[PDB]
Structures are given as C-alpha cells and as structure tokens.
Amino acid sequence: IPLALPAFFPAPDNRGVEAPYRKEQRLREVLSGLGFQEVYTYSFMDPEDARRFRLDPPRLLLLNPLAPEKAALRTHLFPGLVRVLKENLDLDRPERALLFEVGRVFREREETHLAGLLFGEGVGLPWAKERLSGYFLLKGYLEALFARLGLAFRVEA
Amino acid sequence: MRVPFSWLKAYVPELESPEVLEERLAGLGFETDRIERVFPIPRGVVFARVLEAHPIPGTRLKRLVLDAGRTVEVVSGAENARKGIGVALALPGTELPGLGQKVGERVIQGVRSFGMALSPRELGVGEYGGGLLEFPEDALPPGTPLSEAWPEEVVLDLEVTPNRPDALGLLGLARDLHALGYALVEPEAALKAEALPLPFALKVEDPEGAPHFTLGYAFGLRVAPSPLWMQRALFAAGMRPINNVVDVTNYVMLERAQPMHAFDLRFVGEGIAVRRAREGERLKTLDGVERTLHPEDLVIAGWRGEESFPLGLAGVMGGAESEVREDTEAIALEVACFDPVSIRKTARRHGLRTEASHRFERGVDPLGQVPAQRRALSLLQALAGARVAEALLEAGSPKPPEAIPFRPEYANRLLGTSYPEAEQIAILKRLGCRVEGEGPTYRVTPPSHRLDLRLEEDLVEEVARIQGYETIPLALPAFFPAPDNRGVEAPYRKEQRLREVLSGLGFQEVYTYSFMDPEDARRFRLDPPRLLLLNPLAPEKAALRTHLFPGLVRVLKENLDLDRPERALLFEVGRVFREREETHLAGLLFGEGVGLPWAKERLSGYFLLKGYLEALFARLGLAFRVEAQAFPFLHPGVSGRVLVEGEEVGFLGALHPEIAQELELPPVHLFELRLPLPDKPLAFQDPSRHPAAFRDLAVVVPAPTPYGEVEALVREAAGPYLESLALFDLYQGPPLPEGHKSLAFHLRFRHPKRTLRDEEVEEAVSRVAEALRARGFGLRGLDTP
Amino acid sequence: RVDVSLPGASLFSGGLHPITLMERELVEIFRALGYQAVEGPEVESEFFNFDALNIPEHHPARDMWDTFWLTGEGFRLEGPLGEEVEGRLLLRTHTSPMQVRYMVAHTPPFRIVVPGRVFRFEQTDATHEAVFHQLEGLVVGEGIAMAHLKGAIYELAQALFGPDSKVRFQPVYFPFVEPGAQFAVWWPEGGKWLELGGAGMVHPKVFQAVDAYRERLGLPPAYRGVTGFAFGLGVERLAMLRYGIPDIRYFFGGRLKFLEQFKGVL
Amino acid sequence: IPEHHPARDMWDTFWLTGEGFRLEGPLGEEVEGRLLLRTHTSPMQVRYMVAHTPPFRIVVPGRVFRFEQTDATHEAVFHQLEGLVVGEGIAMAHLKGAIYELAQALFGPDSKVRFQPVYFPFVEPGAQFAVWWPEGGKWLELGGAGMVHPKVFQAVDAY
Ligand SMILES: Nc1ncnc2c1ncn2[C@@H]1O[C@H](COS(=O)(=O)NC(=O)[C@@H](N)Cc2ccc(O)cc2)[C@@H](O)[C@H]1O
Ligand SMILES: Nc1ncnc2c1ncn2[C@@H]1O[C@H](COS(=O)(=O)NC(=O)[C@@H](N)Cc2ccc(O)cc2)[C@@H](O)[C@H]1O
Ligand SMILES: [Mn+2]
C-alpha cells in the first residue's frame, strides 16, 4: 500500500474548534513559566479522604476498584497535591515547593480544575534571613498569573 | 497617471462608467488611488470674443471690448489679453468654484467691468492663474454658456507600474480594455502630404543615446489656441494648453506614451544633430532655467556653418529658445526612442522629472516613432493647417520583437486552471500578439509596444489577468517534503520558547530600533559601531547598534519621564551588528523591587535580577554562574560575566554610576547574553530511592574570596555521592578573624543502590576539610547536626 | 562592593510534566499535517466507548478491554451537543469514543487529533499502567484511503526520529476499523521497532452509528459518502523511549526529583 | 531587480559601510557585495533555496528596513512574513488556496480573499491581495505574491 497525504479545505464548522484546547495549554505553560511545577495525580480518590479533608463525599464510585483507597473519583485536586507533598517530604526533604495540577474532577458534572500548592520557607536571599512566603506569597504568584493572563483578580474572605 | 474618463472613452466608446472602468483596470492590474469630478462650470460663465483690447492710460490694465452676445466691457491686467481670442466670461452674478465672492459688475480704473475674463485657476480647470484662458476666437457663438462645450469630467488617478510603459499612454490602456472584449477605436491619421525635400538635415552622432530617431516637417503653420475639446482634455490630464502645435505634441504624448517635441526651424539652422554636450555647454530650458550641461547629456543640437548649439535636453526638456510661438511657420518634429539609462542619468543630474523623462526612463515602443509622427502631423494639419512633407528624416533601424514559445497547457498547469486553448490564443491576439503554429507549443511574437512580454510566463500572466484572477480556482498542495527540509525549524522554535519563558517568568518584552546614536558608543562606553549608514534617517540613527542594553536604558528613561513607573523588569531579543550579525537577549531591572506592597522589606537590585536569571536557566535546564569580571559600562563593584554550561556568553551587573548620572537615572541593573544559548541534552537520571545523608559545616574565608570559588572547592572534594550543596548563611564579624567571613553549607549525600555508611559520609566530609584547609580556609563547624 | 558570585533571590522555577511535554510534541507534529486538537470526557457512556464503536456486550470483543464501571446518581453526562446522554457510566478505556462524539457534532471533511487520559483495570508493571494517555487521530472525507493513513504515520516517524526512520503496518483487529492495523516506527538511535498503536479505515457501522445518532438528534446524515482513517497511540510508551524513562509507573508518582528532570525539555 | 532601472527606484534602501564585517552566505560561505539593510524578507527566499532541495514549504518572519517617511501606517522599520512553496506541480491555485486559508483562520468562515495583478521582478504572474474583514466591513491589503520567476530559479541554481 503506497504512502500519500490528503488535501482538502475543511468543512466550515471545523474552524476554531481547537481554541478550548489551546487555551488550557497556554495556561499550563504560563504556570510553568511563572515558577509552578506541574504534577499528575490519579483521578481516583480514597472514600475516607472526604472526611480527612472535610469535603462532600464522592458522587461517583467504582463497582470494581483497583483497591478501596481508590474506590471513588476525586472531587477536588488539592487533597491529591497535599498527599504528594507529604510523600515527597518523606522520600526527599524538599525545603519548599510550588506545585500545580490541571485535571478532571467529578461531581454533578465532569469539570476541569487548576490547583496549586506552596510550602516551605519562601523566597529571599539563601544566605540572608528575611523572606517572603505563606499566604501572601501564593497570592503574589496568583496576581502575577492573572495579570499575565490579562484578567481581573481579587480574593474575598 | 491621470485618466480622464471621456478621453479614454474616445478609444473605448463602450465604457459603462468611471466606476466600472476603475473595476476593469483593477482586474487588468491598475489600481486607482482616487476618482474626481472636475469641471463644474456655472451658467453665468459664457464664451466671449475679444473684439478689441484698449490700454488704460497710466495703468498696466486693459479695457477689453467683448462680444458675448451683447457687447460688454471688462477690465483685465492679464498680459495675454488681446483682441482676436476667445475667453471665459464670468457675467456678474456668477459663483466661481473657488473665490466665494460672487462675481459682480464693478468699476475699475475708470471703466465698468461687466464681470471678468477668467484664468485657468479662476474657472477651476487648472492651477495656472497668471493669464486668461485662450480659446479659438470662433470656438462658439458669442454668449453661449461655456458648460455646453466644456462638460464636467471624471478623472481617475491610476498607478502604472514600471512593467507597463505602454500604459503611460491612454491608447495603451484602451488596448488592455480591448483585450477584455471592449471595441477599440484607434485614431486615423488622415494626412495630405506633399513630396518635397526637407529644408534641413539630420545627423545622429550618438546612436547609443538615440537608437531610433525621426524628424517630421510641417510648414505653413497658423499657430493659435487649441480647440475646446483639446484644452479640456489636457487640463483634465494635469497639463496646461499653450497653443496649437505644442498642445498637439502633448496630446499625442499622453495618447500613445511617445514624447515628441516641435522645434521652430528659425533656430535649427542647417539641421538637427543628436549628440553629447561639450563640457560646460550651456542651455536655457523651456522652464526658463539657465543650465550647464554634462559631457554625458544627450542633446538635440542645431548647427550653422562651423558653430554647433544645443536646442534641448534630449528626452527630458526642450530648449527655451526653440519653443513654438505664434509667429512660427515651420517646425522639425522630434519623435524618437532614447537610451533609458542616459535619460535616467541626465534627469537625475539636473533634478528634473518630466512627462518625457518619466516615459523614456520606463521605456518607449522601439517602433512607435513613425506611427506617432503620422498622428502628430495629421493633427497639426487639422488644427494648425500645416502642410506636411511626405518624407521623414530617419536614423537607426530597430529590430522587431522575437517569437516566444507558448504552451496553452503550461499556462493552465502553472495557473491551476483549465481554460480552453482557443480562448488563450484569442486573448493573445486581442493584445496584438501574432500566434503561429498548430500546437501544442505555439510561436507567439508580441507587439513592439509591450516591453514586458519576453518569456512564456509573461504570456501566461496575460491569459490569467484577461481571463480574470478570480477565475483561478482554490487548491491546496500535497507532498512529502524533501529530506533536508526536516528539522529546519528548530532554531526558530528555540528562540521563541525563550521569549515565552521570559514573558512567563515576569519579564516585559520590548522592541527597539536597530539603529544606534554614534555618540552613545561614548556615553555607554562601548567600542564604536562597525556598520554605519551612508543615508541615515538622522545622525542619532547613523549606526547599527552593537548592544541591546543601551537601548533598554533609554526606554527606561523615556518611560520614567512620560509615566512614573515605580519599577520595571524588561527584556529584548534582537539582532546586533559587530564583526558578524548576532542575536542577543538583554534584560533590565529597576525600582524598589519585590515584597509586600504595604510592608517595608524588599528583595531587589543585583541579587533580584540574578534571582530571575537563575530561575530562567533552571527552567531552561542549563548550568548558570556569574564570575566577577570588569566591564566599562558596568559598576566596578557590581560587575560580572555570565557562564552558561561553563562558557562565557555575556554579562550581568549594575549600570556604571557615572553613566546613570549622565543620563539622570537612579541605579539600574542589567544583563546581555549571546544567543543561541548552549544546548544540554536530557540525560534522565533515575533518582535513588534510599534515604540521603545530611551534614552541615561552615567555612571561614577571607572577605575578598568569591563565594563561587569556595562553592567549587567544597563540591569537588565533596565526593561522587554529593546530592545537594546549598548556602544557607553568610556572616562576618565576631568571633571571626578580622577581615574574614563564614559560609553556612547544607550538604547531602546519597547512594543509588543503598544507604550510605557513616564511614563513607564522614570520610568524604574529611576529604573536603583537607583540600579546604589545604587551600587556606578554616572549617568553623563540622559534622554539625 | 558586592560578591556577584553569591546566590540570588530564590525565585521558584517551574516545569511541565513529561506527559504534557510529549503530548505537546505529538500535537505539534500532527498540527503541521492539518490536524486540530480537541478533548473529550474521561467519564463516558457505554454507548460511546463501546456500542457506537461496534463493540457489543457479551462477545469476545468486549472481553478484550478491562473496564472500570462507575455508580452514583445525580451525575450529568452531556453528549456531543450538550444533550443528556444515558447508559451505564464508565471510565473510557480509550480515546476512541471522542471519534463518535466529534463526528455527530461536525461535518466532513476534517482532521482531528485527541489526546486524553484513559483507564483500564489491569496489573501495572514497567510498561503497563491502569491510568495512562492516548492520542487519537481521525481524518474523514471523500477519497480518504489507507495510503493516507500510512502517510500520516510515516510523517509521525520522520518528525519523531529523523529521515532514517521508517514505519511498519501489520494487520490487527478492531471492531471499529476495516482494514485494521497495528503499527511500529523504526527508532534509528535505538536500533529497534516500537509498537506505537492501532489504526485502520473507520468501520462502516461506526459511520452508521454516527448518522443514526445524528438523526435521533434531528441532524441530517453526514457520513454516507465519505471514508476515513483513525489511529490510537500510547503517549507514555512514546515518552519513555523518547525521554529515556525506564518505568511507566514514574509518571503518576508525583516525585519532584523525577519531574524536575524535564524542566529543560522545552 | 538590477541597478539603474525603474524597479530599483521602487525601493528606498539603507546602504551600509564599514570593514571587518563578515556576512555569511546560505552555506556559511563569505558572500560579497554592497552591504545594506534588507528592504524585504524576500532575499531569504533565495538563501533557503540554495541551501535546500524541493519540495518544501517555508515561512520567514523578519525585520525589514526602508528609508521613507513614517506616518500612522508607514514605518522605516517594520516586519514582514514571507511564504515560499516550491515543488513539482505547484500552481497559482495553491497560492490562492494558501491566502484563502490565512483569511479563514484570521477572520472566520465569512471571510474571503481578493487577488489583483501587480508587478514584482521576482514573480510572474504577479499579484497583490486583500482579505475581507467581516467584523470591520472592509478589505485589507495584506501583501504581494505570485509564481516565483524563472530567473529567480536560474539565479539560485547558478549560485
Ligand atoms: N495498560 C496500559 N498502560 C500503558 N499503555 C497502554 C496500556 N494499554 C494500552 N496501552 C497503549 O495503548 C495503545 C493502544 O491501545 S489498544 O488497546 O491496543 N488499542 C486501542 O485502544 C484502540 N482504541 C486503538 C485504535 C485502533 C484503531 C483505530 O482506528 C483507532 C484506535 C497501545 O499501542 C499501547 O502502547
Ligand atoms: N514603510 C512601511 N511600513 C509598514 N508596512 C509596510 C511598509 N512598506 C510596506 N509595508 C507592508 O509590506 C507589504 C509588502 O511590501 S511591498 O514593498 O509592497 N512588497 C514587497 O516588498 C515584496 N517583497 C512582496 C512580495 C511580492 C511577491 C512575492 O512572491 C513575495 C513578496 C505591504 O503589503 C505592506 O502592508
Ligand atoms: Mn508581465
């Protein structure tokens, strides 16, 4: 069977069909550019974590789970990131961490989320003592993020 | 070029309207920049005959007795006002296109001026306002409204690209329209010549300059104003009528892109000599400008006995002397083809651009001369009642154009069309081409007037534009690209990721002109530019930048004066020129720095910039360090070179104070590196799963020692199991040795296959203390928990 | 004076997950061939994941896939046109259903590519995960032939491994194509074939399922006179041999020490 | 585009001076001739062809320079994007197809293109084109184009 390449003008309703995808992808890149480290975590959830993390219980469960710790579909992204923090801390002892993850979440409807995590001493002169960190550091990066995305951004209690 | 609708309509009678015409020319390849309606003439303006012109004693004015139906009197100061001519009378009550002062009957120097006779400018037909319009005395029945013989006109402003010199003639344009299908009407040069000798001779001394040169002979001339139709035509085309003879020469020029000049025989002497000027040879041109000729200028000369004199600038402008005035009875009509380069040079040399030089430069039909002679002579006979000689003086024999191979199949192939053979050939014939052969590859020889038809491809463009570019279908090509085209876009992709990463990190991109101010080589202490412009936009832009930071600094200053940014983090990627053209990346930090807007503590200056850079190269996966090195444009205290993957690629530091001061700027930090950056291939390293070894230790060091030197020694002896080496504290004072400082180091060890025995750990921490002190440094703390 | 060799302010430096990197390179490669990237849902209906793709229940074909079935009410699964689709919920065992979703929502000709997270209940070793990623490709239109499918994969190979690379197609079975095929690309630097994925000419019944569903929805048929090819390949499998990753299980490990090694890789 | 001919007179060139400057050719060779700032991206059309073999499709963005007055729509320093597709059977229909795609991609399905003949010593047929901007209700004259001229291909192989 010979090799060939097709040529045609695509039908009208196929135009601009890739904006959604492109959008999410720029987001990840911007994030990786800002300083966030991307992380991929299984879509599964430990039914018990709905309690540990004080979240409404999962709406979707598996009739055939890989294990009971993976018997449900995650409703959030942070629980997972927190666990990877713990895990990373026990294996290696990172002094800090700035992570993010984009992924599907299931609850009422399947939706896409973006979550991030800051942990550690913060930013400053390695040898010096003063440092920027905690809440206002994270909000610092977020403000930068939305400015880079050209979007209004505010946090109300 | 100006295209008067009704004039063009004389050759293309079926033109639908000026709007459709514009449409038609766009498709043919002629863009019209604008369309104007031009000769609005009020009813109050009528034709009048000047019965008599009387001078008003003691003034420079004349009382004109006009026959405008009834006899009326009018006062005029126009030098050309004289009896025996027709004029444009604005009866009192008329509204002239541009004076808003309704014309009225007024008393001037003793006489009641019943309205006034008009100039081209007053009527609104031309810019000339130094004299009255001069019509033929019998042009119309006295008193008839000028409108009736001078209707409004629509003029298109057409762009005529250099490849269509034949389009600098309205007839040339008409032929193109003919190709589209329109009937074409060529003027018939009805001539009643006489077989007699010409009372002068032709000597073409420089054939290189005048490849084809002809002279016509017209006598018994009755020079007078041109007919209304012709004055209206010339005025619409942006030219000003002078008289019978001159007007005809301009009319024909515009008609068939063939400049021609009439020389009054009184001045020709024994004959016309086409030659180069002698150094210094003078010539006063028609514009009334006394000029000095260059031995390179081709000239139309006359001679008498042993004297030779210039009568005009060949192909550019006629001599002031030889102009045809009213007492002129016989002329020599120059109709030639001049060497484009020569005309070009000459026109430049005297700062002239005439309807003639313009055409001779773009090129002229190498064989249109004789046909043009017939047209002009024919018209002279009809308007000036000229008697014309049957013969012409002719020099040079131009060869007709050659045949061009043409395959209708190749035309359709190159265009992606499928026009039937017959249509293709029918079109080429409408454009005047001769088509020989039965196919598939014909012999097409173009009309001498198309200088732009030499290749088969030219011929296919003809078919496409006449068929219409919109008839060419839309398609997409499909092919496997040739092997050496693969991966050709890595360089580009690389630089682009860089910019994006930078914009992601927090840097704001800036674009700055590639130009440089030669003086800034000094202000910014840089070697002077290697490339300069022979034609700079200005002296501040007379050179090509050798760096990128100077520019960024200036934009900082500029931004500060316009708006008052409290800070700034900029970057720019661009070409720099020095020895070789290279791509650079420069950045700038300025302001208070980063921290809590409301709080006081802040991170900024040098270590802030280096902070971002370290982040940048980490995000790029590249080794990065800065070693102290002196830089003329940098602060002696804060200045270092940048090493990426161990190689020197640029610098980082604070702007030298003196420079900041001369530019009135607060401190500024910056850096500039050369691109493309070093490449380090991903070498995945499976991280050990066993616990790591932690050990702290300080190193007392003399204040002058650079952190990088210590860091390096520690890592070296640190052993092959050193995972991490970080600096967590720098201190100098008590209880340390005056002039000394300690460096708190966090160390980590790890073995890929298993946990490390304290033997291995301490043993290494020792090898370090050895070379450490063996260098000259003290080990304050050791095995610190 | 300042010690310029000293460490600067510790600003964070981010990075992208290797799967993201590999997905991006694959999408870039197919974008150059005119493909557009679109995504589908992870939680899918049995209709889209199976029935529409010609994989009916209680037959050897079903027994080839290891499906994760879901439960729970109040969950809304929207169809290609935002409609409420019904059927037993499940985690998609492949990206192929997005092949039917796209076709009911659009009209040929077109070229799509759809990366996505897929799930399969099976044992995880060094080259097998229960949670991995695939990249579907679908090109539908008048005159589309298997030669075009081969051409596409040939381009993938050239783009991925240079001019000395080559492709190999062998027949294999998929209820959703006919002809069906599995393919490998020649990795010149490693001297061995890599089995990337499956492909073939979209099955007549798939086109029928699409228009039939379009009719239920009130749309006119759109795939009666067209043909098309589609393929599905393993992203992790390609990333592993491309970035030199030895164990597929690292991907979802979340270990920063592992991830940080790709900060450079674009 | 040879010297001392109407064609040259169409461009407003910035000429440079200075020695010790090394200008490398398509294959890193040392090329000679009067240095200047490129008045367009078109030269990259010859550089690429001598360094590669057809068929191929390139696009080359770039900073160009022209000595002319700067108004609201004219700069002495601006940017162009060249496109070049060479290969057996390439036709003007493909050129039209390309621009049609540009338009669709840039302004949506209700967009359209318009080609009119124009002159360029480097193509034949030659053309200028505009794209229909639906949201703004007016044609935009984007650039020039055509079928690469026979002499350009000759200059390339000769080099
Ligand atoms: N458990 C697993 N872990 C990691 N990767 C896995 C995996 N199971 C499969 N894969 C990868 O997934 C690829 C395709 O998966 S498959 O079950 O063999 N084939 C399918 O799922 C079909 N949808 C492929 C297909 C066939 C024809 C088409 O026209 C379109 C798509 C394989 O080539 C393999 O590299
Ligand atoms: N001074 C100026 N400032 C800003 N933009 C400018 C400019 N001068 C020109 N341009 C832009 O540059 C585009 C093309 O420039 S041009 O001088 O008219 N045409 C050229 O330079 C040719 N190289 C175009 C070309 C023609 C045919 C080809 O096969 C390839 C290229 C214009 O359509 C215009 O939008
Ligand atoms: Mn031509």
Closest CA to B373 of B243, B230, B223, B253: B253
Cis? peptide before B734, omega within 30° of 0 = no
Spelled out in words, what is the top-level CATH class assigned to the domain B1-37+154-186? Answer: alpha beta
Report d(CA A106, CA A101) in Å as an integer.
Answer: 15
| Contact yes or no for B71/B17 (Cβ under 8 A) | no
For residue C188, give both structure tokens. Answer: 């010149």
Q: Is the dihedral of CA C48, C54, C57, C62 positive or negative?
A: negative
Q: Do B480 and C154 touch (CB under 8 A)?
A: yes
Chain C closest-CA separation from residue B488 CA (Å): 11
Report d(CA B156, CA B521) in Å as an integer.
Answer: 52
CB of D40 shorter than 6 A to ligand 2: yes
SS3 B169: coil
Nearest ligand to residue B162 Cα: 3
| Contact yes or no for C129/A30 (Cβ under 8 A) | no
Other beta carbons within 10 Å of B415 = 25
For residue B633, give both structure tokens. Answer: 């444009």
Cβ-Cβ contacts under 8 Å for D33 (sequence gap 6 or more)? none
- The CA–CA distances, whole Å, from A9 to A154, B651, C69 equal 45, 51, 40
| Contact yes or no for D128/D118 (Cβ under 8 A) | yes
Q: Enter the DSSP assignment of D8.
A: G
DSSP string for residues in B665-679? ----EEEEEEESPP-
**Superfamily of domain B489-679, CATH level 4:** Bira Bifunctional Protein; Domain 2 (3.30.930.10)
| Contact yes or no for B736/B700 (Cβ under 8 A) | yes
Backbone angles phi, psi at B376, to 5 degrees: -70, -45
- Per DSSP, what are the bridge partners of residue C230? C138, C200
Q: Residue A119 corresponds to which amino acid?
A: F
Q: Residue C196 corresponds to which amino acid?
A: L
For residue C161, give both structure tokens. Answer: 């491994």
SS3 B165: helix
Q: Residue B347 corresponds to which amino acid?
A: A
Report d(CA B583, CA B548) in Å as an integer.
Answer: 10
Q: Which atom of ligand 2 is nearest to the CA of D41?
A: 23
DSSP string for residues in B305-344? TTEEEEEEETTTEEBSTT---TT---EEEEEEE--HHHHH
- The CA–CA distances, whole Å, from B30 to A46, B70, B92, B455 equal 74, 49, 44, 21
- Length of chain D (residues): 159
Helix axes C18-31, C235-243, angle to 10 degrees: 100
Helices and strands, number each (H, E), in chain C: 7, 10
| Contact yes or no for B457/B414 (Cβ under 8 A) | yes
The dihedral formed by the CA atoms of C186, C189, C190 and C194, expressed in degrees to the nearest 10: -30
The H or E element spanning position B613 is: helix B606-619
Q: Enter the DSSP assignment of B471.
A: G
Report d(CA B46, CA B146) in Å as an integer.
Answer: 5
SS3 B444: strand
Report d(CA D4, CA B340) in Å as an integer.
Answer: 9
For residue C137, give both structure tokens. Answer: 């490709």
Cβ-Cβ contacts under 8 Å for B633 (sequence gap 6 or more)? B524, B525, B526, B549, B655, B656, B659
Report d(CA B4, CA B255) in Å as an integer.
Answer: 11
Helix axes B707-717, B758-775, angle to 10 degrees: 140
- The CA–CA distances, whole Å, from C121 to A60, C240, D35 equal 17, 21, 68
| Contact yes or no for B608/B628 (Cβ under 8 A) | no
Query: H helices of chain C, where?
Result: 18-31, 46-49, 97-105, 146-161, 204-216, 235-243, 256-259
- The CA–CA distances, whole Å, from B157 to B16, B21, D74 equal 18, 12, 21
| Contact yes or no for B74/B103 (Cβ under 8 A) | no
Q: Enter the DSSP assignment of B149.
A: G
The H or E element spanning position B562 is: helix B549-562
Other beta carbons within 10 Å of B188 = 9
Backbone angles phi, psi at B438, to 5 degrees: -110, 0
- The CA–CA distances, whole Å, from A116 to A38, A81, A101, A120, A138 equal 9, 8, 6, 14, 9
Query: H helices of chain A, where?
Result: 19-34, 49-52, 78-91, 135-148
Backbone angles phi, psi at C214, to 5 degrees: -65, -40
> Domain spanning B690-775 has what CATH number?
3.30.70.380
Backbone angles phi, psi at B488, to 5 degrees: -70, -10
Cβ-Cβ contacts under 8 Å for B357 (sequence gap 6 or more)? B315, B316, B317, B343, B344, B346, B347
In this complex, the chains that touch C, judged by 3 or more CB pairs closer than 8 A, are: A, B
Closest CA to C147 of B651, B182, A4, A146: A4
Residue C14 burial by CB count (10 A; 0-12/13-18/19+): exposed, middle or buried? Answer: buried
Q: Which atom of ligand 2 is nearest to the CA of D74?
A: 3
Please name the member of B500, B594, B744 whose beta carbon is closest to the beta carbon of A33.
B500
Closest CA to B166 of B254, B261, B260: B254
For residue C87, give both structure tokens. Answer: 């059927």
Q: Residue C180 corresponds to which amino acid?
A: G
- The CA–CA distances, whole Å, from B785 to B43, B710, B747 equal 111, 21, 11
Cβ-Cβ contacts under 8 Å for C100 (sequence gap 6 or more)? C48, C52, C53, C80, C206, C209, C210, C213
Report d(CA C155, CA B9) in Å as an integer.
Answer: 59
Closest CA to B154 of B247, B232, B42: B232
Give how far the C-alpha of residue D111 lies from the chain's centroid of Cα atoms, to the nearest Å.
23
Q: Enter the DSSP assignment of C39.
A: -
Q: Which CATH number fits domain A18-157: 3.30.930.10, 3.40.50.300, 3.30.590.10, 3.30.390.50?
A: 3.30.930.10
For residue B300, give both structure tokens. Answer: 């139309």
Report d(CA C96, CA C176) in Å as an integer.
Answer: 9
- Length of chain A (residues): 157
Backbone angles phi, psi at B7, to 5 degrees: -75, -50
For residue C266, give both structure tokens. Answer: 């674009």
Closest CA to A100 of A45, A32, A52, A4: A32
User: Cα angle at C64 between C62 and C68, to 5 degrees?
Assistant: 70
Closest CA to C156 of C144, C143, C167: C167
State which approach was used to obtain the coordinates. Answer: X-ray
- Per DSSP, what are the bridge partners of residue D60? D82
- The CA–CA distances, whole Å, from A101 to A40, A104, C252 equal 6, 10, 12
CATH number of the domain encompassing residue C196:
3.30.930.10
Residue B432 burial by CB count (10 A; 0-12/13-18/19+): exposed, middle or buried? Answer: middle
Where in chain B do CATH 3.30.56.10 domains reside? 1-37+154-186, 401-474
For residue B641, give both structure tokens. Answer: 């070179």
Task: Please identify which residue in the block is written with the tokens 């008003």.
Answer: B56
* Residue of D120, D124, D140, D141 best suited for mutating to test ligand 2, as the one with most atoms within 8 Å of CB: D120
Q: Do C8 and B707 touch (CB under 8 A)?
A: no
Report d(CA B554, CA C127) in Å as an integer.
Answer: 57
Write b or e for each residue in C188-212: b if 16 or more Cβ atoms lie within 10 A of its Cβ, otherwise e. Answer: eeeeeebebbbbbbbbeebbebbbe
Backbone angles phi, psi at B129, to 5 degrees: -125, 10
From ligand 3's centre to the CA of B452, what distance in Å? 5
- The CA–CA distances, whole Å, from D137 to B643, C263, D116 equal 54, 46, 19
For B62-118, what is the HEC assignment? Answer: EEEEEEECEEEEEEECCCCCCCCEEEEEECCCCCCCCCCCCCCEEEECCEEEECEEC
From first CA to last CA, the distance across chain B in angstroms is: 91
For residue B466, give both structure tokens. Answer: 């006449």
Closest CA to B751 of B703, B689, B699: B689
CB of D149 shorter than 6 A to ligand 2: no
Where in chain B do CATH 2.40.50.140 domains reside? 38-153
- Per DSSP, what are the bridge partners of residue B215? B334, B393
- The CA–CA distances, whole Å, from C204 to C59, C70, C176, C220 equal 19, 30, 8, 17
* Residue of C132, C133, C248 best suited for mutating to test ligand 1, as the one with most atoms within 8 Å of CB: C132
Closest CA to D105 of B641, A10, B690, B68: A10
Domain that holds residue C39: 1-266
Q: Do A127 and B730 touch (CB under 8 A)?
A: yes
SS3 B123: helix
Report d(CA B192, CA B141) in Å as an integer.
Answer: 30
CATH 2.40.50.140 fits B38-153, yes or no: yes
| Contact yes or no for C75/A60 (Cβ under 8 A) | yes
Spelled out in words, what is the top-level CATH class assigned to the domain B401-474? Answer: alpha beta
Domain tally for chain C? 1
Helices and strands, number each (H, E), in chain A: 4, 6
Nearest ligand to residue D75 Cα: 2
| Contact yes or no for B730/B744 (Cβ under 8 A) | yes
Residue B55 burial by CB count (10 A; 0-12/13-18/19+): exposed, middle or buried? Answer: exposed
SS3 B618: helix
Where in chain B do CATH 3.30.70.380 domains reside? 690-775
Report d(CA D76, CA D91) in Å as an integer.
Answer: 34
Report d(CA B98, CA B106) in Å as an integer.
Answer: 19
Report d(CA A142, CA A145) in Å as an integer.
Answer: 5
Write b or e for each residue in C114-144: b if 16 or more Cβ atoms lie within 10 A of its Cβ, otherwise e. Answer: bbbbbbbbeebeeeebbbbbbbbbbbbbeeb
For residue B72, give both structure tokens. Answer: 């009326």
C37: chain A residues, CB-CB within 8 Å: 18, 21-22
Q: Residue A44 corresponds to which amino acid?
A: F
| Contact yes or no for B75/B63 (Cβ under 8 A) | yes
DSSP string for residues in C98-122? HHHHHHHHS-SSEEEEEEEEEE--S
B469: chain D residues, CB-CB within 8 Å: 115-117, 127
Backbone angles phi, psi at A9, to 5 degrees: -90, 120
- Per DSSP, what are the bridge partners of residue C133? C117
Closest CA to A132 of B602, C7, B592: B602
Nearest CA in chain A to B728: A127
Q: Do D104 and A15 touch (CB under 8 A)?
A: yes
SS3 C196: strand
B134 is annotated as contributing to ligand binding: no
- Per DSSP, what are the bridge partners of residue B522? none
Cis? peptide before D55, omega within 30° of 0 = yes
Chain A closest-CA separation from residue D87 CA (Å): 15
SS3 D22: strand
For B573, left (φ over 0), alpha (ψ -120 to 50), or beta?
Answer: beta
A/B interface, count of CB pairs below 8 Å: 57
Report d(CA B6, CA B771) in Å as an integer.
Answer: 100
Q: Do D101 and A9 touch (CB under 8 A)?
A: yes
Protein fold of B187-400: Phenylalanyl-tRNA Synthetase; Chain B, domain 3 (3.50.40)
| Contact yes or no for A104/A110 (Cβ under 8 A) | yes
Q: Enter the DSSP assignment of B539.
A: G
Chain D closest-CA separation from residue B161 CA (Å): 7
Give how far the C-alpha of residue A36 lies from the chain's centroid of Cα atoms, to the nearest Å.
10
Give how far the C-alpha of residue A68 lies from the chain's centroid of Cα atoms, to the nearest Å.
24
A79: chain C residues, CB-CB within 8 Å: none
Report d(CA B616, CA B607) in Å as an integer.
Answer: 14
Closest CA to B223 of B327, B79, B151, B100: B327
CB of D42 shorter than 6 A to ligand 2: yes
CB of C122 shorter than 6 A to ligand 1: yes
- Length of chain B (residues): 785
Task: Please identify which residue in the block is written with the tokens 């996505």.
Answer: C116
Chain D closest-CA separation from residue B460 CA (Å): 7
Nearest ligand to residue C174 Cα: 1
Report d(CA D60, CA D41) in Å as an integer.
Answer: 7
Q: Enter the DSSP assignment of B126.
A: -
| Catalytic positions of C | 65, 94, 120, 134, 177, 230
| Contact yes or no for B321/B299 (Cβ under 8 A) | no
- Length of chain C (residues): 266
| Contact yes or no for B378/B186 (Cβ under 8 A) | no
Please name the member of C15, C131, C255 whose beta carbon is closest to the beta carbon of A91.
C255
Report d(CA B115, CA B45) in Å as an integer.
Answer: 9
Backbone angles phi, psi at B256, to 5 degrees: -130, 35
For residue B355, give both structure tokens. Answer: 């309807």
Task: Please identify which residue in the block is written with the tokens 């992924």.
Answer: A103
For residue A101, give both structure tokens. Answer: 């993850």
Cis? peptide before B371, omega within 30° of 0 = no
Q: Enter the DSSP assignment of C187.
A: E
- Per DSSP, what are the bridge partners of residue C15? A37
Query: H helices of B107-227, where?
Result: 120-123, 170-179
Report d(CA C113, CA A18) in Å as an integer.
Answer: 10
